[PDB]
Design a protein around this nucleic acid. Structure first.
Ligand code: MG
Ligand code: MG
Ligand code: MG
Ligand code: MG
Ligand code: MG
Ligand code: MG
Ligand code: MG
Ligand code: MG
Ligand code: ZN
Lengths: 81, 129, 87, 150, 185, 208
RNA sequence: CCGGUCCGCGUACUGGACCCAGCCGAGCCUUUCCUUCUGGGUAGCCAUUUAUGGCGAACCAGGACUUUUACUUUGAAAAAAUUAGAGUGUUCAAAGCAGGCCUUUGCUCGAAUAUAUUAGCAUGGAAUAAUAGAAUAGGACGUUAUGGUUCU
């Protein structure tokens, strides 16, 4: 392809690129509001969390760190902030 | 490591122009790169180019129009006396009637013809034709 | 190229590629000259009245000639929404 | 890349273009600071405090909220460690390898790795002396290293 | 006139301060208009019959204005019709030292001309946040900035932007174009 | 630009899909990427026949620009396309090259069937590689019917279609013949039904 | 833009550009000024007591300070011979620095000019590449800010 709009790449193909290979690098992670099933308390949790986050009320582990995104425990619902 | 961002910029421009592409992406940007491109743009060897701010060194997208034969840096940026400018244009330029040697002088970045007009000299920076 | 008195001492002002602006040499036998007929409002091809493009042998060798014509023809109205600037 | 390897990995963090706090962030620039000091007394290094902040408190960057980087805040409250954290972990690993080497004398691989870590210590300690983070007479001693980290 | 932090305020500044001593009548926003002050009211004429009103504020006082600026502008636009109201902080620009210039204290980056023009370019579009800036270098020689704004809170500025371009041109002399790439369109 | 009477009509669009023209090869080269609309879950690539139609109209306009109709050479080495090119030459006056292409027909001027076409039209760049190669020696532009796996080297006008279909080849050739005659004025207008049927131009086995 | 003239594209000369644009500059304004000291000296501010109250920048001449370089412009300096090079019928030339005038009880062009180059000296500029600065503030201004401790 000799002629191509480098300043306005297709947003579909722009999203398949590596996170450092976009026009402006941008994280694909986000922060979430996590509802444990046991109670209702807003707890902001990083999507790629490295910590076994526990809610303040009861000392129950909410998520377990993995290689990539943290895994929410069963009964825990997330909403992207 | 990355020792000359101007060399990276001109190599990308050369590779895109030799391969027939009409646009090229340059990373990283700098003041010297932008002022080098403005001289090339001023003589018509390239078209409009665009600077993208990413809160970092930056990126540039240059539009090529096929008139550029070759642009390059001179590393290191040798000191050039006024009497030595004649010798440099003979070695680097294809003829005595066209082509420009880019210098960095205390009066600013300019072509060898402009440097003779304002009677200034500095360090050699590159060439374009 | 002309002398001081202004006479064009140049013989053979050469053609240039429509895609890459390279000079098409005298022995570049991979270079072609596309001739595309003009069509009147009745749907008829107008005899001897054409839109013309030239491609150097370099562009054709890389296989980009087809995509270059898509771009060149779309800018001239010969085509609609077939070539996209953004990929 | 990779000063002491043949690797060419590029994995790292990619900061967002926005330098401002997210609209949904409600904590003040103070409440984060008292949170940092509370965690700093538990013994966390600046790397670990930042990990906990985004992992459990939604603090994407301490700089976009407070205005200063994490190590700058600790040094402003007299909580800066004497040895910088990264230099500490290189010396601690070298201590661990040296402790392993005296019991496994034929482990020539650990001997090769120890030279890399100590070379990395000396380059970093020399840098810290030019920026006046370490005293000009500061020198890393293998014999007395266990005192500094243990 | 106590609201004005300048000696000999103009009639326009008095009228604006007269509005400032009237919006606290409703107690929803009153606990914060006592300390609010401003230094100047620069007004220019934009095309289309409108007029740009620039309120200049001490930079340390900027974060106090930012807390109520969204509401306060809407009623100030009601009191003064066909007026576009913006709030700018009076940042100080320190000139670049010459080589032979006598040594002064090291110039902080917030006082540099690049930072200040970037800063006023940020105060101009306050409800929205900048997600990207581009600079075109045209073949003619002139340079044009492009600023990309977030679609969130876009309705506060989406009918202006043209006032901003001329206002930015008045303050700095350079050309800028504001675009919101992610609108519904 | 172009009158709206030249737009893709629903009748022709029905023909193209029924002839499996829209079925492109599983693997697509980078040069044919703009012509792919979407990949079908089995693996076949769906051809954007709107783009296919416009290339056909563009190609027919180039053919109409050649003064001598016999100077246009239509080629097919595939057996599926041999009948199509022979009938195209009869209707349009072009020069058909069915079956084997003798190497040197364009460069060796003492061969028997030594031709000098002003334009060469190819059914498939892969099976007609020899015909395409010599055109790049004597400044001959090439129009080619290309699948998603067909090479694009030295091809100026690419018609995106299914090269490996019995009905796809015949239909595309039939469409070109109709448009060339419409521009020449043989067909009175773009709405008159053509006498010739797309069944002619279709390859017939020795069984019948 | 009369090319008259000067000595026939001629076109040099040169009245005359009305300067199209372009090029080398200089200041002033945009938040942007050698912080200065001692006069001239005071002219106009703040002219209510002037060039009898408080515009030292309203430009000089006599003092006081100064982040360090590299680089590049210009200047002085780098002996003569040699080199390049202007002039000059040593009969030409290599050379030489001679020589020329109506014929002289004497008149009279000259004997240029360039180049040196690392180092040193003075100088304009401030791109490029370094360097220093305000972080436990021991930081900067108060022109006439208030004292105190010392020292000349
Ligand atoms: Mg031009
Ligand atoms: Mg050479
Ligand atoms: Mg030249
Ligand atoms: Mg050129
Ligand atoms: Mg790398
Ligand atoms: Mg190494
Ligand atoms: Mg990293
Ligand atoms: Mg109230
Ligand atoms: Zn819970």
């Amino acid at each position: 392809v000799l002629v191509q709009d480098l300043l306005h790449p297709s947003p579909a193909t722009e999203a398949k690129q590596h996170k450092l290979k976009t026009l402006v690098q941008q994280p694909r992670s986000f922060f979430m509001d996590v509802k444990c099933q046991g109670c209702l308390n807003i707890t902001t949790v990083f999507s790629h969390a490295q910590t076994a986050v526990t809610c303040d009320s009861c000392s129950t582990v909410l998520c377990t760190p993995t290689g990539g995104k943290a895994k929410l425990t069963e009964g825990c619902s997330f909403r992207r902030k | 490591t990355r020792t000359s961002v101007l060399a990276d910029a001109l190599n990308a421009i050369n590779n895109a122009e030799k391969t027939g592409k009409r646009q090229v992406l340059i990373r990283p940007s700098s003041k010297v790169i932008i002022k080098f491109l403005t001289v090339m743009q001023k003589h018509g060897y390239i078209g409009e180019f665009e600077y993208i701010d990413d809160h970092r060194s930056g990126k540039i997208v240059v539009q090529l129009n096929g008139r550029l034969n070759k642009c390059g840096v001179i590393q290191p940026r040798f000191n050039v006396k006024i009497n030595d400018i004649e010798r440099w244009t003979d070695n680097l330029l294809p003829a005595r009637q066209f082509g420009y040697v880019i210098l960095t002088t205390s009066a600013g970045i300019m072509d060898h013809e402009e440097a003779r007009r304002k009677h200034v000299s500095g360090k050699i920076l590159g060439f374009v034709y | 190229m002309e002398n001081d008195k202004g006479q064009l001492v140049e013989l053979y002002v050469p053609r240039k590629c429509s895609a890459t602006n390279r000079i098409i040499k005298a022995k570049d036998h991979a270079s072609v000259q596309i001739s595309i007929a003009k069509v009147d409002e009745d749907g008829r091809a107008i005899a001897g009245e054409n839109i013309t493009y030239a491609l150097s042998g370099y562009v054709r060798g890389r296989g980009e000639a087809d995509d270059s014509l898509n771009r060149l023809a779309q800018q001239d109205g010969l085509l609609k929404n077939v070539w996209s600037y953004s990929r | 890349g990779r000063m002491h390897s043949s690797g060419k990995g590029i994995s790292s963090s990619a900061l967002p273009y926005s330098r401002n706090a997210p609209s949904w962030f409600k904590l003040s620039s103070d409440d984060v600071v008292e949170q940092i000091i509370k965690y700093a007394r538990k013994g966390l290094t600046p790397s670990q405090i930042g990990v906990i902040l985004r992992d459990a408190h939604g603090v994407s960057q301490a700089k976009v909220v407070t205005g200063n980087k994490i190590l700058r805040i600790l040094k402003s409250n007299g909580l800066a460690p004497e040895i910088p954290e990264d230099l500490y972990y290189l010396i601690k690993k070298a201590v661990s390898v040296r402790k392993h080497l005296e019991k496994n004398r034929k482990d020539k691989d650990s001997k090769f790795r120890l030279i890399l870590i100590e070379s990395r210590i000396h380059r970093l300690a020399r840098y810290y002396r030019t920026v006046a983070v370490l005293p000009p007479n500061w020198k890393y001693e293998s014999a007395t290293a266990s005192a500094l980290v243990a | 006139s106590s609201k004005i932090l300048s000696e000999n305020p103009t009639e326009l500044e008095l009228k604006v301060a007269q509005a400032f001593v009237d919006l606290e009548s409703q107690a929803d926003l009153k606990a914060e208009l006592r300390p609010l002050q401003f230094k100047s009211i620069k007004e220019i004429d934009v095309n289309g019959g409108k007029k740009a009103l620039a309120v200049f504020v001490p930079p340390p006082s900027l974060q106090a204005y930012r807390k109520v600026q969204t509401r306060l502008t809407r009623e100030l636009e009601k009191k003064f019709p066909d007026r576009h109201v913006v709030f700018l902080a009076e940042r100080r620009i320190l000139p670049k030292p010459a080589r032979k210039a006598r040594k002064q204290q090291k110039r902080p980056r917030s006082r540099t001309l690049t930072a200040v023009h970037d800063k006023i370019l940020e105060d101009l579009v306050f409800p929205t946040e900048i997600i990207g800036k581009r600079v075109r270098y045209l073949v003619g020689g002139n340079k044009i900035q492009k600023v990309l704004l977030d679609s969130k809170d876009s309705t506060a500025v989406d009918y202006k932007l043209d006032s901003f371009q001329q206002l930015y041109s008045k303050l700095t002399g350079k050309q800028v174009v504001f675009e919101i790439p992610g609108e519904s369109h | 630009s172009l009158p709206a009477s030249f737009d893709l009509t629903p009748e022709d669009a029905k023909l193209l899909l029924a002839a499996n023209v829209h079925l492109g090869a599983k693997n697509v080269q980078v040069h044919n990427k703009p012509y792919v609309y979407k990949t079908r879950p089995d693996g076949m690539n769906i051809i954007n026949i709107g783009k296919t139609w416009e290339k056909i109209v563009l190609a027919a306009r180039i053919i109409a620009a050649v003064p001598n109709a016999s100077d246009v050479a239509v080629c097919s080495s595939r057996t599926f396309g041999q009948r199509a090119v022979l009938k195209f030459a009869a209707h349009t006056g072009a020069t058909a090259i069915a079956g084997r292409f003798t190497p040197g027909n364009f460069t060796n001027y003492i061969t028997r069937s030594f031709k000098e076409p002003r334009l060469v039209v190819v059914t498939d760049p892969r099976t007609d590689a020899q015909a395409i190669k010599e055109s790049s020696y004597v400044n001959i532009p090439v129009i080619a019917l290309t699948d998603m796996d067909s090479p694009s080297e030295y091809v100026d006008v690419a018609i995106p279609c299914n090269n490996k279909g019995k009905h796809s080849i015949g239909l595309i050739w039939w469409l070109l013949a109709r448009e060339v005659l419409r521009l020449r004025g043989i067909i009175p207008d773009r709405t008159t039904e053509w006498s010739v049927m797309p069944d002619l131009y279709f390859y017939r086995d020795p069984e019948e």
